[PDB]
Amino acid sequence: RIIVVALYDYEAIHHEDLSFQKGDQMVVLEESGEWWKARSLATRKEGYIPSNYVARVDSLETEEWFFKGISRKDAERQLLAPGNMLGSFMIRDSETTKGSYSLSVRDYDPRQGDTVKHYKIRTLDNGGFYISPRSTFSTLQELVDHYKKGNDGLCQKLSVPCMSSKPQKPWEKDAWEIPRESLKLEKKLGAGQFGEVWMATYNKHTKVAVKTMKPGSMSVEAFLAEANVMKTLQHDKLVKLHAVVTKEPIYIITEFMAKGSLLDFLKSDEGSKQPLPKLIDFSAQIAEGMAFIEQRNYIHRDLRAANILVSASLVCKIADFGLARVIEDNEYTAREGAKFPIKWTAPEAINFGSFTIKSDVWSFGILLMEIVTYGRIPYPGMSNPEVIRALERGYRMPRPENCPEELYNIMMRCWKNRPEERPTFEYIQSVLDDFYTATESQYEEIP
Ligand SMILES: CC(C)C[C@H](N[C@H]1CC[C@H](n2cc(-c3ccc(Oc4ccccc4)cc3)c3c(N)ncnc32)CC1)C(=O)N(C)C
């Protein structure tokens, strides 16, 4: 026997779904991918429900202030999002002390501006919790209520939990290779060299994006082999692949991203006004996604601002990872022009076709420059031959205006001519994540 409790509002979208509002009764039979075999016994309608819409009985996932599955950096971003107030907070699983917890609180001071402070919540050997030894609690709820009444040493009195939206409903079960008829293409988002992108509706009920590859551009078996790897690369900073139409012309169905590519966004009224620390946060988000790709021994092959997507809430999500590998070179694709852009591509990839995570690192440096210049072409004023010959002689794009020197230093490391001398994405992720909070305490040492 195993019991769970609902969290959000969701009713049937498919056939054998259930209905619940503001948390109802659930009895999970056994698990699956993202859907769980649910037993209601209250509405007595039985079938499947989204596993991320429910919470286990005994645990903290029911609490409005608890955020399971998120990182320290995630916590900082979520709290600093517009809509949160001074003292907004969350409790999360500790990233550096397994089994214990961390409290993250939105702070403000005139010197540093908007910040997030983190506190270690220690667990007592025989039960209960504390941040400061003089103030212990039987439960985390008691801890929260205590610091809601006064700061008692914290940077701020706790106000309200960090804001959050209901999670995206999981993709339809066993709907990986889907019929073309399941898709209504509603709005063309852009033409492209080897395919178009559409906003579309899947089976009348779900908004998606569809990349529609041009005839002749890919074959079914080669694409599917790769797509079956792509779909497993799941990470908050990679765009999610939902489904594919595995008949020519091949369709790739993904989550829809409201603000288009990062290049589009940086060139828009809204995006051109993002301040430098937000640009650096975008850079960090992408580095986090590329560190994941690196950890998974994968290769992007075409990293650039046009292949980063931006969500309605300004989350960056890497797109087109691995796609270049399965675009065919034949008479049909040749008429669409150059396959990869010289100005973004590492010299060893151009010269010897050596595409690796290190050639992605080179490209990431070019992408950093795109970001800090709000989408300017790389190497302005230079032709492609000029770029290649300049690079061979140690020329690199000079530091532009409004670019922190340490960000430029990261670019220069990415652009080492020898791939082995380029940093890892793990390294880049660390430096960008900590860009402004370097030489600071991880946690606040409360009295
Ligand atoms: C101002 C724009 C009109 C200019 C336009 N910009 C584009 C930028 C990109 C936009 N674009 C592209 C995608 C996208 C969809 C599927 C996909 O498939 C894969 C995903 C992962 C791994 C493998 C394949 C990749 C990207 C996408 C999206 N899911 N949601 C919103 N916009 C999107 C569509 C608009 C452009 O570049 N043109 C050449 C016209």
Side-chain angles (χ1 to χ4, degrees), residues 189 191 197 209 211 239 241 252 254-255 257 261 264 309 320-321:
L189 302 178
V197 177
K211 178 165 279 196
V239 71
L241 278 81
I252 311 166
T254 71
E255 52 183 337
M257 291 291 122
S261 70
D264 297 344
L309 305 178
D320 270 18
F321 41 91

Side-chain angles (χ1 to χ4, degrees), residues 56-173:
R56 296 187 178 180
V57 181
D58 305 317
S59 59
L60 303 151
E61 289 83 305
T62 57
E63 302 293 347
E64 190 185 338
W65 39 256
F66 189 74
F67 283 70
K68 187 159 179 290
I70 75 152
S71 71
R72 163 185 273 242
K73 195 67 180 178
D74 290 334
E76 294 183 353
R77 294 186 177 119
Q78 292 289 329
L79 277 163
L80 291 160
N84 294 293
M85 46 176 300
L86 184 69
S88 279
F89 71 99
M90 63 166 67
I91 311 280
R92 57 190 170 75
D93 292 296
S94 176
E95 280 207 305
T96 50
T97 299
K98 173 195 164 306
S100 297
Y101 302 92
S102 298
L103 169 71
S104 293
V105 188
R106 184 160 175 168
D107 194 19
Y108 182 86
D109 67 285
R111 164 180 158 76
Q112 303 199 260
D114 300 305
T115 64
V116 169
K117 295 295 191 304
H118 306 278
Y119 302 85
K120 298 181 183 180
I121 305 177
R122 305 189 169 276
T123 68
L124 294 158
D125 296 322
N126 287 343
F129 308 91
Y130 73 95
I131 291 166
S132 175
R134 73 178 183 271
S135 304
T136 66
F137 312 97
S138 315
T139 67
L140 289 176
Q141 183 59 63
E142 289 180 358
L143 185 147
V144 171
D145 288 324
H146 173 86
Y147 288 108
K148 280 182 66 177
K149 290 170 183 162
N151 67 315
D152 187 20
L154 299 188
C155 58
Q156 301 290 335
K157 170 178 52 180
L158 306 183
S159 52
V160 300
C162 189
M163 290 192 55
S164 59
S165 310
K166 48 154 55 183
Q168 289 184 347
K169 313 187 178 185
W171 187 251
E172 177 180 345
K173 181 193 175 61

Side-chain angles (χ1 to χ4, degrees), residues 304-319:
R304 48 184 152 165
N307 283 336
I308 307 298
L309 305 178
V310 178
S311 73
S313 60
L314 303 191
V315 180
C316 294
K317 296 187 187 278
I318 299 168

